[PDB]
Write a protein that binds this ligand. Structure first.
Ligand code: MN
Ligand code: MN
Ligand code: MN
Ligand code: MN
Lengths: 317, 222, 318
């Protein structure tokens, strides 16, 4: 098809920053070459605002970075809306998972009947009242849900976000760590999810078959794949944020991405929490980055059994 | 349908370094080994280096061993040659060549070459002067008219007329190194005298080495 | 049964060097003790005539280097033909996957109706002209498929090879890293294969059931198991030249080997791409080597429950 690549180096203050190198690491793992090889038109929009995290002290944590983030997401949503209207599928490299706000927002502006598949160990679905002060990396979904709106507070920089998606239009895969309220929210608002248990109990294949019966069961719709890197077992994905053990096998995540491709309706993708500072060694970093590249590529057709790259006939001696 | 195209030729001083690139297209680049062969000014061919088509296998002439460094990137269909500690001796045209080992050793496809100059002189852009067509040859028949490209280093300059619109009657001559060790050449065009009155003539002079691209009108004087 | 062990120290050059220590590593992992314990009569034929050079590098690679392999394979095929006629099952330690040319050739000379199971992340079904002269780590199947001959060039040292097997008589397991032509060849010539997707699709159990229904469905045939070590996920198999991620689980590869044993038709086995210089540490080397030993052993009977060695005793102090 056509594919738009958007760098979004987001952060939640010092001790949690470094993820900004996330997009650059994926890039440095030959993202462009591989998507090029699949035979898809590549417009890379470079990195986004990358506000140099102001004075890295003060009340910047309290208000300056969160206000700047909220607006950074606004800019992103604009780029995404622009890229998506021009007919491109949108790849968004992260960066913290918070960039999901902008991407699903900007996507929704031309694709209002879109659905979400959330591959992540966490549900990333708290209210801002439930924030851990190191804030928004794991509560982005709330602003987007059009049933949790009456219980989420208008924050500085987030005035622009209007609830894009219903609770019955996001489906989660990979759940391993969940805070009590999130579990409540998911049960309460009747949000569909498949955890490692469901994966083990049903098999990856049936999970995707159910997921598609839920989202695109009665109506063809554009799909937004938000992929958190922590979703994969930490042995595979050792350079992430709050990584949880008992995560997806390499083959399971390829299988997801592959399945998503086969539906044909992939409209945008997010690849997030790819912090290389987290890695102990160069190999740990590159292995995570390389895993990312694979996930994107698998979603856009790369088949492992051999590429779809045309060959009319072989040579003559 | 199949081409090699060298780039990154330039001037470098004693002690200096430079990276030559070679674009391929029309074959599976990773299917064949490649080779760098150089031609010193007014001498024969000399092998420099070669690399396995798979990659990760590098061989060098004893002249360039441990100073030069062959490499490639099959994903982007490119060969390269990092050249360090270059001395005046290294001055030549460097041609990237497809290497074939089907029965013995032969290089079956070359590029157009790219010049490397190692002189301790400095890249100088040209002065461009208009050449008076002919005071006499103003009335009848035709008359010669040209551009002088003077005091430029190193080679080469390229000349076109009216942005390449005029090429019938055009003659561009080889350059010559003066005793000052500096290059100069001329390009002349023959048009009918009657046309000169109401047809504009401008030579376009491009010097890559100083990135000077001068457009210079030529018309008769008093 | 009886088992013949053949060392085949093949290589491409300095880059893929250490494959010659390939066998010796598997040996040093107690291959002999373990096959001995299964009850197999063990004739080890040591290491086969090598693939070295004099000055090294030069133009050896692309001229003398591939001539050396082509003929080395000829020698191997002779030893295999000899070992197989003497009634032995043939274990071939590698070495690069090129040695498979000789082994399937030499095997076919007394077992002309043989079928192949190719466990490898790759298909190694490129030609000599459809890819670089990288010592045919992924070119050993072309020379052996009768359907591919009109599209392969007679090379220096490969004059001797006659195509042993049909396209409907080799089945692949473990595909993860396939070049554009290879996929084309496999689709074009109608060659059956089960990659990681197919593994995840049906489970290892169905793969072995389908594999056997294809190859030995309508007639019992002697089976040639060519096992590339890269086939296992690189966490298991970290000491191979070209390791591809998302590879087979330990349990899946044992299950394959075990399934192969239960057919009872295993006539020869190749265990290759286990060059251990590639390892970062002693443990990485030995763990890969030890994995090899297991694979061979599982193929020749070693299992999780009972492990052969039948016990009808029922002791007491009566
Ligand atoms: Mn997340
Ligand atoms: Mn997560
Ligand atoms: Mn192989
Ligand atoms: Mn292999």
């Amino acid at each position: 098809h056509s594919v738009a690549v958007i760098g979004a180096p987001f952060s939640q203050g010092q001790k949690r920053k470094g993820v900004e190198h996330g997009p650059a690491a994926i890039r440095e793992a030959g993202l462009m070459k591989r998507l090029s090889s699949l035979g898809c038109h590549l417009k890379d929009f470079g990195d986004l605002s990358f506000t140099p995290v102001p004075k890295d002290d003060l009340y910047n944590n309290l208000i300056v970075n969160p206000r700047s983030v909220g607006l950074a997401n606004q800019e992103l949503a604009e780029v995404v809306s622009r890229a998506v209207s021009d007919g491109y599928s949108c790849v968004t490299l992260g960066g913290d998972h918070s960039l999901a706000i902008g991407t699903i927002s900007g996507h929704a502006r031309h694709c209002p009947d879109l659905c979400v598949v959330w591959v992540d160990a966490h549900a990333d679905i708290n209210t801002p009242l439930t924030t851990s002060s190191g804030n928004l990396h794991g509560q982005p979904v709330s602003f987007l849900l059009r049933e949790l709106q009456d219980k989420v507070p208008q924050l500085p920089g987030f005035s622009w976000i209007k609830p894009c998606i219903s609770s019955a239009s996001i489906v989660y895969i990979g759940l391993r760590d969940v805070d009590p309220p999130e579990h409540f929210i998911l049960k309460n608002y009747d949000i569909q999810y498949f955890s490692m248990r469901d994966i083990d109990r049903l098999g990856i294949q049936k999970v995707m078959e159910r997921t598609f019966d839920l989202l695109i069961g009665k109506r063809q719709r554009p799909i937004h794949l938000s992929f958190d890197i922590d979703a994969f077992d930490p042995t595979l994905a050792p350079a992430t944020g709050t990584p949880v053990v008992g995560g997806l096998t390499y083959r399971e995540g390829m299988y997801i991405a592959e399945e998503i491709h086969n539906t044909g309706l992939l409209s945008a993708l997010d690849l997030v929490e790819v912090n290389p500072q987290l890695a102990t060694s160069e190999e740990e970093a590159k292995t995570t980055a390389n895993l990312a590249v694979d996930v994107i590529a698998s979603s856009f057709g790369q088949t492992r059994e051999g590429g779809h790259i045309v060959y009319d006939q072989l040579p003559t001696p | 349908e199949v081409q090699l195209l060298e780039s990154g030729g330039g001037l470098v001083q004693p002690g200096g370094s430079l990276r030559l690139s070679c674009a391929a297209s029309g074959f599976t680049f990773s299917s064949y080994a490649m080779s760098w062969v150089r031609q010193a000014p007014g001498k024969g061919l000399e092998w420099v280096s070669a690399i396995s088509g798979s990659g990760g296998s590098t061989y060098y002439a004893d002249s360039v061993k441990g100073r030069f460094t062959i490499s490639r990137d099959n994903s982007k269909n490119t060969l390269y040659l990092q050249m360090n500690s270059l001395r005046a001796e290294d001055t030549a045209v460097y041609y990237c060549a497809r290497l074939r080992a089907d029965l013995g050793l032969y290089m079956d496809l070359w590029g157009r070459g790219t010049l490397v100059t190692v002189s301790s002189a400095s890249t100088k852009g040209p002065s461009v002067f208009p050449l008076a067509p002919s005071s006499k040859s103003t009335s009848g028949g035709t008359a010669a008219l040209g551009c002088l490209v003077k005091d430029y280093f190193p080679e080469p300059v390229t000349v076109s007329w009216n942005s390449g619109a005029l090429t019938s009657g055009v003659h561009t001559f080889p350059a010559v190194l003066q005793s000052s060790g500096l290059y100069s050449l001329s390009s002349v065009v023959t048009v009918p005298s009657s046309s000169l009155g109401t047809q504009t003539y401008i030579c376009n002079v491009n010097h890559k080495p100083s990135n000077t691209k001068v457009d210079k009108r030529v018309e008769p004087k008093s």
